[PDB]
Structures are given as structure tokens and as C-alpha cells.
């Protein structure tokens, strides 16, 4: 009767309202969080909402196995199987630094090491949590993963016709191929050559994690048919990873995976979503 959730990245933004919005429908959460105190004033808030299910804490840092371990027991001990993970957690690999004349084109810088960090958190830390959580997944009657993606995380936001021959052949995509792009891609941004090799020049490796995360997402659906699991883009939301700029509410974009947590047991799977809409991975 009782339904189990973990959201990775929940004290705040996109994560919080996907919480918020499981629990409100009944449904068991496990709000998770990097760093403790951020978790647990998360869940105070979420506590004083009266909602129908039930919140938890538990400390969780996708790049760190221990972390990771302990989630994992720990939903074993508590619940024994888990029916809905949201791999919410991520970053944006970049950091701060007459009207008309402003010029942006230098407030966003991107390194190799933040580089590094974005795909260890996005898309690692997707495929790790994921990997610890699959045997408890596996005891629901109707499991789903939803991975939080972006609308930049579709092909044609790579130019490279190697990244691309790789990445959009669906029928051989297998994660070592996805580890072959990333390298790659990694190498080629610390020798200053991501434009000669057909990679974004901007947002570079917010981009290419989003895209490696949904054909991780193809990768999943193919192997458990019996589970629900999609991507999505939630839309441009007004949180912290956009320094509060964007269209829609948090509260509004979290609709969107919260909608594939919920899909009715004949439900869809291997796709992604640009917010309400089945969307091309092209
Ligand atoms: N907002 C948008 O416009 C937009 C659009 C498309 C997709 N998305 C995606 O939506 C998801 C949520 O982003 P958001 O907009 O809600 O941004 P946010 O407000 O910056 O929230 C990011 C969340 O991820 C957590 N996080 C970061 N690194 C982590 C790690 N190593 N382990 C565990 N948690 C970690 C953050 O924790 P801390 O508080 O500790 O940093 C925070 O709880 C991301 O996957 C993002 O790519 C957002």
C-alpha cells in the first residue's frame, strides 16, 4: 500500500518541490541532501506542510560510495525495496566571476576541474546512486527512475559527428561508449580544443552530461522493461543553478518529473520529456 521514494538533491530548488509534491500525493520520501543542516531545515519546512506521506532525511552526496552505501542500507533497513528514485542532484559546471553596452560574455567562467566536478555529480553520481538503489527498485511491484535532464541535452547541442554517430545509436549504446564521449570530451577541454572538435563551447560540460545522461537513460529502460524510466527536462526555472533567473517557478518545473513518478503501471519508458511532452533525444 505504501509507496518509497528517494530524491537526490532535495534541500532546495527543483529537488525540494519534487519532494514536496510526492508527499503531498502520499507517497513515503526520503528527502536527501550533500550537507546535513541544509537536509535538515529542508525537512523542518517539509514537516510543517501537513502533507499525507511521510518525510525523511537521509545525508547523501552522489560522488561518495560511502554516502551512497549508507543511503542504500539504510532504505533496505527502513523499507525493504524502493519504488520511485528522482536523480535530481546537479550543478552547472560554472562559476560567477548606457545599459545597452553591458557585455556578459566573461561572468561565467568554466575550468577543467569544474568540468570534472559536473560529470562526476551529474552524470556519476546519476549512474552510482542508481547502481546502489537497482536491487531495491527491483522488489517494487512497479518501479521508476526519473533522471533530471535539460533541453541542452539534446544531440544537436554537440556538433561532433564522432560524438554524436556514438551517442544517437540507441540500438548500441552500452556505458563503456558513454565513458569513450566523456573521456574524450574531458581531454579535449583540457587541451583547449573544444571548438576544432565539434563540443559547445559554452556550458560544455553541463551540456555533454545532460546528453550522456539521457542515453544512459535509453541504456536502463532497454534492460528493466518492467520499470518506468525517463528523463526530463523540467524547464527554466527560477533556482539557485541559474542564480535565480528562469521562466517557471521550481515549484512549477517540479511537475514535470513528478508526472513520471507517478505514470499510471502501463506507462511509458525510455523516453525523454521536455517538461509535459514526449520530446526527441535528437
Ligand atoms: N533550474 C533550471 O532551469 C533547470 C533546467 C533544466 C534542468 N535542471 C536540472 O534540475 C536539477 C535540479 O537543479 P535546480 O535547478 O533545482 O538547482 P539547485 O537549486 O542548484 O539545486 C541543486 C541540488 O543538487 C544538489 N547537489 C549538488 N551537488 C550534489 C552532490 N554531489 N550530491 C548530492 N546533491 C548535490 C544541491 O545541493 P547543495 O545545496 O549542497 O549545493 C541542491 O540540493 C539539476 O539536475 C539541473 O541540471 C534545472
Partial sequence: SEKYAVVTGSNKGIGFETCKKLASQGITVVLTARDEKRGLDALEKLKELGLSGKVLFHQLDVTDSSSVASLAEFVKKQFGRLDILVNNAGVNGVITDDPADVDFSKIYKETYELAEECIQINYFG?????????????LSASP????????????????????????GDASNLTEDRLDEVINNFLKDFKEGSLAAKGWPPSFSAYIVSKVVVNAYT???AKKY??????????????????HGLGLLTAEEAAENPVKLALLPDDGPSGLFFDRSEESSFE
Fill in 126 to 138: 546519476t549512474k552510482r546512486t542508481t547502481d546502489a538503489l537497482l536491487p531495491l527498485l527491483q
Fill in 144 to 167: 521508476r527512475i526519473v533522471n533530471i535532464s535539460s533541453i541542452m541535452g539534446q544531440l544537436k547541442n554537440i556538433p561532433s559527428e564522432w560524438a554524436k554517430g556514438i551517442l
Fill in 218 to 220: 535509453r541504456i536502463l
Fill in 225 to 242: 522493461p518492467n520499470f518506468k524510466i525517463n528523463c526530463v527536462c523540467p524547464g527554466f526555472a527560477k533556482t539557485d543553478l541559474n
